[PDB]
């Protein structure tokens, strides 16, 4: 997603990003959500297993 | 150094279509914009349309909003244009030219003569 | 025409695609050095500002 | 007496609280540079060779 790499599972979510926010981060600076660049949906990211 | 190989001359009949290829060299097929122009005998040189293969976006001149198809084949680094519903008024020498991003030069071919 | 160094010229680039392969591979530059990024990954990344 | 005195079970509560802190520390320690350009392996790998 715009240069942000990794492995995981995308799900839809209800985090409400502010207009200027592009990515979310958890407690360990792990991207835990992104805004999709073409359709501006918020997608949560979790580990595969 | 970029050079463009043009198709040879062709004689068409009214109502037919003509397709002209543009073979790139110097690579840079993606990242460059390819334009097509035509010069009818006795006239100046007129832009018809063009395509940017990496974006897969094609733009046309207003007089050519229809009858002209511009496409590209990345695997052979070749651009193409086809003009349909031909009439004798379509006689022209057709040219492709490249304008690479990162540059300001335009690389021109020799010219393809098509009459109808 | 280039600016004098005492009064250098800075421009904004936006809403576009950049294939950095050309600058990188061209042998014309005397210096090509990147800071913080690998020159060869410039095409995988997406940048702002 | 047990119902009314909130500190009555502190000896057990403390075990729980100490172990929780031990894990919270490990998670928080992930967000450190340790001299690296960033705390995230994916960013290091994404931009550098
Ligand atoms: C991007 O282009 C596609 C067509 O290729 C279109 O369906 C989509 O809505 C466009 N998205 C945005 C944000 O413009």
Resolution expressed in Å: 3.3
Enumerate the β-bridge partners of residue B80: B21, B71
Token reading at A22: 């592009």
The b-or-e profile of D28-46 (16+ CB within 10 A means b, else e) is eeeeeeeeeeebbeebeeb
Running DSSP on this structure, what letter comes out for residue D24? H
- Sign of the dihedral defined by the CA atoms of residues C18, C20, C21, C26, in that order: positive
Element (H, E) at A44: strand A42-46
Enumerate the β-bridge partners of residue B82: B19, B69
State how far residue A16 is from chain D, nearest Cα, in angstroms: 24
Q: Is A35 exposed, middle or buried (0-12, 13-18, 19+ CB in 10 A)?
A: middle
Running DSSP on this structure, what letter comes out for residue C37? S
Distance CA(A42)–CA(A18), nearest Å, equals 11
Distance CA(D47)–CA(B62), nearest Å, equals 44
Rg (CA), chain D: 20
Running DSSP on this structure, what letter comes out for residue C44? T
Distance CA(B53)–CA(B55), nearest Å, equals 5
Token reading at B14: 């009214």
Distance CA(A2)–CA(B84), nearest Å, equals 41
Which CATH class name applies to B3-114? mainly beta
Residues of C in contact with B101 (CB under 8 A): 17-19, 22
Residues of B in contact with C22 (CB under 8 A): 28, 31, 100-102
Distance CA(D3)–CA(B6), nearest Å, equals 94
Half-sphere exposure of B50 (CA within 13 A, CB side): 16
Residue of C nearest to A4 (CA): C45
Residues of B in contact with C23 (CB under 8 A): 102
Running DSSP on this structure, what letter comes out for residue B37? E
Dump strand ranges (E) for B1-116.
5-6, 10-11, 18-23, 32-39, 46-52, 57-60, 68-73, 78-83, 92-100, 106-108, 112-115
Residues of A in contact with C43 (CB under 8 A): none
Whether D47 and chain C come into contact, CB under 8 Å, resolves to yes
Nearest to D46 among A3, A27, A30 (CB): A3
**8 Å CB contact between B68 and B83:** yes
Running DSSP on this structure, what letter comes out for residue A6? -
Distance CA(B98)–CA(B77), nearest Å, equals 12
- Measured in whole angstroms, the distance separating CA B67 from the mean position of its chain's CA atoms is 14
Residue of C nearest to B26 (CA): C22
State how far residue A18 is from chain C, nearest Cα, in angstroms: 18
């Amino acid at each position: 997603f715009n240069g942000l790499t990794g492995t995981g599972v995308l799900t839809e979510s209800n985090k409400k990003f502010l207009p200027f926010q592009q990515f979310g981060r958890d407690i360990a600076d792990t991207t835990d959500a992104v805004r999709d660049p073409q359709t501006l949906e918020i997608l949560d990211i979790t580990p595969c297993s | 150094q970029v050079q463009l190989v043009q198709s040879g001359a062709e004689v068409k009949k009214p109502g037919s279509s003509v397709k002209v290829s543009c073979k790139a060299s110097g690579g840079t097929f993606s990242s460059s914009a390819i334009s097509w122009v035509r010069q009818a005998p006795g006239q100046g040189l007129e832009w018809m349309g063009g395509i940017i293969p990496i974006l897969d976006i094609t733009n046309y001149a207003q007089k050519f909003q229809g009858r002209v198809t511009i496409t590209a084949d990345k695997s052979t680094s070749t651009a193409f244009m086809e003009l349909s519903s031909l009439r004798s008024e379509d006689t022209a020498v057709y040219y492709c030219a490249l304008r690479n991003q990162w540059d300001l030069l335009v690389y021109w071919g020799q010219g393809t003569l098509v009459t109808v | 025409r280039f600016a004098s160094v005492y009064a250098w010229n800075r421009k904004r680039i936006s809403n576009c695609v950049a294939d950095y392969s050309v600058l990188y591979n061209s042998a014309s530059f005397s210096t090509f050095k990147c800071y913080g990024v690998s020159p060869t990954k410039l095409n995988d990344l997406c940048f702002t500002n | 007496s047990l119902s009314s005195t909130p500190s009555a079970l502190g000896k057990l509560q403390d075990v729980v609280n100490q172990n929780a802190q031990a894990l919270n520390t490990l998670v928080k320690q992930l967000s450190s540079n340790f001299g690296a350009i960033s705390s995230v392996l994916n960013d290091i790998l994404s931009r550098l060779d």
